[PDB]
């Protein structure tokens, strides 16, 4: 009931758990055999992005639709190479040309981020609105950033 | 038969009713749980409006059609944020792209 960083304390073994302290420098040695060529995987062409909803909130209050025109249907990953937005889902399924939904949480009031998707990337941009409740019962999911300007 | 503001008068209890006087300052504390996200409800895109009929009258003599292109069919509200026009109906039903 007094430890810093919100640590829980247990006695067998003597230990502290769930300390929200620092970061873990993970290093991954991925074998050369596990990689797959760009040609095999679904290749995306002529994509467009739009934030059909944005709630600047701790949880994934942000929704964005990506209109896609894929070279072949299947499944492939989605990411944001920046700390502006953190996505709920890792990969999405695609059917020729259509639309897909991406959930995310954001820090920027005027969000703009490069959504990397399936050997391409689309510049998602929009304006975002404040959340409902002052206090929430779970920790932050989106990386804080300096920019929250007009 | 003489009261101001058109009040009706009754005797048990002694009282006046239907006095068209003043206004009531209503205050509503709406719970946070009753609100619904914009994403869930039907979202309207690329709407157009036209007054297919207007009769400046005490009753709802004015008619207007809204051509809509909705994101998903359902029901949702309609209002006028101004004192210029007062609507008879509160909400309307929408079917993909059409008219209401």
């Amino acid at each position, epitope marked *: 009931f007094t430890a810093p960083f919100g640590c829980e304390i247990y006695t067998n073994p003597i230990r502290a758990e769930n300390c929200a302290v620092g970061s873990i420098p993970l290093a991954f040695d991925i074998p050369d055999a596990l990689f797959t060529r760009v040609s095999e995987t679904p290749t995306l062409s002529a994509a467009e992005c739009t934030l059909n909803e944005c709630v600047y909130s701790s949880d994934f209050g942000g929704i964005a639709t990506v209109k896609y025109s894929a070279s072949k249907s299947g499944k492939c990953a989605v990411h944001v190479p920046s700390g502006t937005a953190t996505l709920k889902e890792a990969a999405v399924e695609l059917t020729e*040309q259509g639309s897909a939904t991406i959930h995310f949480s954001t820090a920027n009031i005027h969000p703009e981020f490069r959504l990397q998707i399936c050997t391409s990337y689309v510049t998602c941009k929009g304006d975002c609105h404040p959340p409902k409740d002052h206090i929430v019962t779970h920790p932050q999911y989106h990386a804080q950033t300096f920019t929250a300007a007009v | 038969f003489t009261a101001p503001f058109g009040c009706e008068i009754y005797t048990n209890p002694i009282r006046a009713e239907n006095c068209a006087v003043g206004s009531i300052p209503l205050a509503f504390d709406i719970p946070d749980a009753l609100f619904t996200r914009v994403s869930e409800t039907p979202t309207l895109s690329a709407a157009e409006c036209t007054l297919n009929e207007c009769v400046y009258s005490s009753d709802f003599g004015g008619i207007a059609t809204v051509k809509y292109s909705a994101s998903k069919s359902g029901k949702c509200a309609v209002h006028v944020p101004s004192g210029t026009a007062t609507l008879k109906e509160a909400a309307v039903e929408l079917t993909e792209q059409g008219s209401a």
Partner: antibody
Amino acid sequence: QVQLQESGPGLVKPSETLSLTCTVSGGSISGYYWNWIRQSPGKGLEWIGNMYDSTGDTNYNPSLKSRVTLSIDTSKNQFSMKLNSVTAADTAVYFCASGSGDWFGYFYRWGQGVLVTVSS
Amino acid sequence: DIQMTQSPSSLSASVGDTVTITCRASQSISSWLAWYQQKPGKAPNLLIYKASSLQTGVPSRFSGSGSETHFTLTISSLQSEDFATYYCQQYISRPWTFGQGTKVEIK
């Protein structure tokens, strides 16, 4: 939402070019895909190909690719089909709809279809 | 192309009967499958999109299910206006294709 209407029915001579237009009303062609599908009376539906509204790219049925051209006409809010070197095997009802796929609702509108008879 | 195999090709039924039509894709199409109804001399009509979503204006006696390669169209209790040809279709893996159709005739 969207209404589609194929141009009128009639004859095309063997070896000549079948040409159809689809006119969209109550909606623009500035989104989605725009498609032609045909049906030989009594039989099934065969997808011919599509044009993607936003970028104009086309995809064709492999069995027809060598003979088919699709195009979009922004000035009339129309799109068209050209099918070269027809034979009697191309007699069919041709429908124009938002086939392939759209970023929010496709193939929800199917043109009533127009009968093209290939005949000498 | 992705080959769509519809089963059965023909079905005889009576008003009130429960009807099931199956659709098999040559490869996985996740949930990207639509069902259409077509009557003689008329254009197809969308009934179900993305395997299980009922199109607005379509009665709830129509329902769709399945994912991957196997899909099902169920008509809970067949009505007179339900006698027609039904087609499945996948918008997936170059290109988009239809099943051969299921003709539902009056027993």
